[PDB]
């Protein structure tokens, strides 16, 4: 704002507002599942055992 | 025939010879349980992977 009256009385009025905003969200979800199953032998009793 | 299979068969034969069909059938079912239904005459040795 600038106001000059009678070419003698001067006035100035400078007003500034400034807002800055920042947001960051970061999500990580790692899931891991390992499953090993070995079956080597099948052992049975002889039918003629005691 | 193997020794054990022959022995089980002889036991069933003797039980039948004793005119006792009750434990004869029980002994036969035991034979089925111990030696299964079929006899494998041919296999294919090998391996597989998926």
Curated annotation (Swiss-Prot), chain B:
Protein's organism: Mus musculus
Residues listed as glycosylation sites in the UniProt record: 19
PTM characteristics: Proteolytically processed in two steps to generate the Macrophage-expressed gene 1 protein, processed form: cleaved by trypsin in proximity of the helical transmembrane domain releases the ectodomain into the lysosomal lumen to orient the pore-forming domain toward the endogenous membranes, and processed by the asparagine endopeptidase (LGMN). Proteolytic processing in antigen-containing vesicles is pH-dependent. Monoubiquitinated in response to bacterial infection; ubiquitination is required for vesicular localization and antibacterial activity and can be blocked by bacterial cell cycle inhibiting factor (cif).
Deletion consequences: Impaired immunity characterized by a failure to efficiently prime CD8(+) T-cells to cell-associated antigens. Defects are caused by impaired cross-presentation of cell-associated antigens. In normal conditions, mice do not show any obvious disease phenotype or a change in immune cell frequencies.
Name the UniProt record assigns to this protein: Macrophage-expressed gene 1 protein
Subunit text: Homooligomer; predominantly forms a homooligomeric arc-shaped pore complex instead of complete rings of 16 subunits.
Residue numbers of the full-length protein present here: 167 to 216 of 713
Induction entry: By CSF1 in fetal liver macrophages. By interferon-alpha, by interferon-beta, by interferon-gamma and by bacterial infection with E.coli and M.smegmatis in embryonic fibroblasts.
Free-text note regarding domains: The MACPF domain includes the central machinery of pore formation: acidification causes a significant structural rearrangement, leading to oligomerization and deployment of the transmembrane beta-strands (named TMH1 and TMH2) that enter the membrane as amphipathic beta-hairpins.
GN (gene name): Mpeg1
Residue ranges the record marks as coiled coil: none
Places the protein is found: Cytoplasmic vesicle membrane
Stated role: Pore-forming protein involved in both innate and adaptive immunity. Plays a central role in antigen cross-presentation in dendritic cells by forming a pore in antigen-containing compartments, thereby promoting delivery of antigens for cross-presentation. Also involved in innate immune response following bacterial infection; shows antibacterial activity against a wide spectrum of Gram-positive, Gram-negative and acid-fast bacteria.
Tissues with expression: Expressed constitutively in a variety of cell types including macrophages, microglia, neutrophils, T cells, marginal zone B cells, keratinocytes, splenocytes and intestinal epithelial cells.
Family under the similarity heading: Belongs to the MPEG1 family.
């Amino acid at each position: 704002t600038e106001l000059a009256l009678f070419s003698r009385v001067n006035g100035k009025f400078s007003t500034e507002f400034q807002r800055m905003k920042t947001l960051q969200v970061k999500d990580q979800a790692v899931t891991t599942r390992v499953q090993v199953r070995n079956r080597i032998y099948t052992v049975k009793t002889t039918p003629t055992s005691e | 025939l193997s020794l054990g299979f022959t022995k089980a068969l002889m036991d069933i034969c003797d039980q039948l010879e004793k005119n006792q069909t009750k434990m004869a059938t029980y002994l036969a079912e035991l034979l089925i349980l111990n030696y299964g239904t079929h006899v494998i005459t041919s296999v294919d040795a090998g391996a597989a992977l998926v």
